[PDB]
């Protein structure tokens, strides 16, 4: 079932532009609130060439704080849980594809996911390492049949203070039949720090009504 302290252990396999990563890491949160940390850590092809938050958003909709008239797919769909696939855009060219799997083991959740990005420039900001934070951003949650679809406009804020634009497009899956929700909103801040070879993720989600 689910606790209001949840932890997450995360593997995630990927390359970009033929640079072949994996990151492993773990997280605790409440879901009820919408709020986690995570401490993460490049084991495999680190030093990673590119600015780490192009994959920031593949490391959980179960940690959204969801009103309690409003469906929730994603705390519906457990114990068996649910995956998504994402297409992420960027205005010069660069894309990505991320698909994550969340499921439960006797600590908490499981977290898998690939990640694959090409066509960075080379000079650009991603490539040169530029990247700070996402803006806060608000995803737009349609349900289609048994799914949900998500769009959110993104803006990877760089050294300097200019805006990298992407856009978002994510299909979540449950493994079951569950009641959807309504078209709505979900409002996320993540932010990005660091603790030496330590990347650390906060996320804050809350689910809203149109």
């Given at each position: 079932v689910l606790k209001e302290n949840m932890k997450t252990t995360y593997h995630m396999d990927g390359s970009v532009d033929g640079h072949y990563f994996e990151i492993e890491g773990e997280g605790t949160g409440n879901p009820f609130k919408g709020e986690q940390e995570l401490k993460l850590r490049v084991?495999?092809?680190?030093?990673?060439?590119?600015?780490?938050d192009i994959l920031s958003?593949?490391?959980?909709?179960?940690?959204t704080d969801y009103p309690?008239?409003?469906?929730?797919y994603f705390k519906q769909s457990l114990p068996e849980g649910y995956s998504w696939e994402r297409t992420m855009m960027y205005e010069d060219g660069a894309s990505a594809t991320a698909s994550a799997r969340i499921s439960l083991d006797k600590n908490g959740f499981v977290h898998k996911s690939t990640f694959h990005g090409e066509?960075?420039?080379?000079?650009g900001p991603v490539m040169k390492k530029k990247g700070v934070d996402w803006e806060p951003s608000s995803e737009t949650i349609t349900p289609e049949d048994g799914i949900l679809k998500g769009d959110v406009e993104m803006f990877l804020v760089l050294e300097g203070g200019q805006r990298l634009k992407a856009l978002f497009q994510t299909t979540y899956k449950a493994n079951k039949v569950v009641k959807m929700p309504p078209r709505h909103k979900i409002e996320h801040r993540l932010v990005r720090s660091e603790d030496g070879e330590t990347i650390q993720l906060q996320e804050h989600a809350v689910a809203k009504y149109f």
């Open positions: 084991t495999k092809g680190g030093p990673l060439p590119f600015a780490f958003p593949t490391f959980n909709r179960v940690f309690e008239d409003m469906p929730d066509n960075f420039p080379a000079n």
